[PDB]
Design a protein around this ligand. Structure first.
Ligand SMILES: C[C@@H](O)[C@@H](C(=O)O)[C@H]1C[C@H](SCCNC=N)C(C(=O)O)=N1
Ligand code: NA
Ligand code: NA
Ligand code: NA
Ligand code: NA
Ligand code: NA
Ligand code: NA
Ligand code: NA
Ligand code: NA
Ligand code: NA
Ligand code: NA
Ligand code: NA
Ligand code: NA
Ligand code: NA
Ligand code: NA
Ligand code: NA
Ligand SMILES: [Zn+2]
Ligand SMILES: [Zn+2]
Length: 259
């Protein structure tokens, strides 16, 4: 389950399909009027994601938007390639637009000094907190969830099967990780941003959570459960609370370690 590994795609609920790699989530939200892709995975992973979209019966040329959680190689490295293959517009939080364009994270990033660059994308545009992305019948909401990066966005929508609907959340990373030379205790904006983000995420309507790193909400255990239980195995309306709690615990452990 490396970041760039093949992974047979699968439908999670309704028109929400997992098209990511073995290690990094990417989601296609489909419609007859075109599709939205969330994240690109790695540069090498773009070829996996593209093949997976086609394996689900969809055309790349019908992907109209690519939504970015945040601008690190593991989630965004494949966006540039996907953008070329699709012609889509890339949407991101304001403070991550320049990073997506260039593929270089800035000095404000806690991991600056330790990150690998990734390919810059074309057609990158900003969205604001609370903003709706509409495409035909699709409606995806942006929630600012800064901390891991300044422009991190968590994306939400509803998917339905014969009128039975669920609230789906593609949860951005909420993790306090850094270069060796970085002290969170010296950077109050980052700490405040992380804390605000745990609070936002634990309040979301959240039947089905798909974490950027899929194991964060036990995707693979859930998929194994689903073989017998069906797609209810993906449903757990405490998942966003649990992702937020794990974020909080990581930060609190880190601040304690810094004293
Ligand atoms: C560039 C880094 O951000 C990347 C790396 O290993 O290089 C990893 C580290 C953390 S934590 C990874 C697993 N998730 C834990 N909650 C992470 C993320 O939370 O998105 N990505
Ligand atoms: Na694959
Ligand atoms: Na591009
Ligand atoms: Na476009
Ligand atoms: Na973003
Ligand atoms: Na950034
Ligand atoms: Na960044
Ligand atoms: Na651009
Ligand atoms: Na971080
Ligand atoms: Na994470
Ligand atoms: Na520091
Ligand atoms: Na520093
Ligand atoms: Na798992
Ligand atoms: Na079921
Ligand atoms: Na269930
Ligand atoms: Na369940
Ligand atoms: Zn990251
Ligand atoms: Zn990551």
């Amino acid at each position: 389950r490396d970041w760039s590994s093949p992974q047979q795609p699968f439908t999670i609920y309704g028109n929400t399909h997992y098209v990511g790699t073995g290690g990094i989530s990417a989601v296609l939200l489909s419609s007859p009027q075109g599709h939205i892709l969330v994240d690109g995975t790695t540069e090498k992973g773009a070829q996996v994601v593209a093949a997976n979209i086609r394996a689900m019966g969809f055309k790349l040329s019908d992907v109209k938007y690519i939504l970015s959680t945040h601008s690190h190689e593991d989630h965004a490295g494949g966006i540039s390639a996907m953008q070329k293959l699709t012609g889509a517009t890339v949407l991101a939080g304001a403070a991550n637009v320049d990073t997506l364009r260039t593929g270089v994270s800035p000095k404000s990033d806690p991991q600056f000094g330790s990150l690998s660059n990734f390919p810059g994308s074309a057609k990158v545009r900003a969205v604001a907190d609370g903003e709706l992305v509409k495409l035909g019948p699709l409606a995806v909401k942006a929630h600012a969830t800064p901390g891991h990066t300044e422009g991190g966005i968590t994306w939400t929508w509803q998917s339905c099967e014969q009128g039975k609907c669920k609230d789906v959340v593609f949860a951005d990373s909420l993790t306090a990780v850094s270069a060796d030379s970085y002290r969170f205790s010296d950077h109050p904006e980052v700490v405040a941003s992380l804390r605000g983000s745990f609070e936002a995420v634990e309040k979301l309507s959240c039947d089905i959570a798909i974490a950027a790193h899929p194991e964060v909400n036990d995707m693979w255990t859930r998929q194994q459960r689903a073989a017998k239980e069906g797609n209810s195995a993906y449903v757990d309306n405490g998942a966003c609370r649990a992702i937020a709690a794990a974020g909080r615990k990581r930060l609190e452990t880190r601040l304690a370690s810094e004293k």
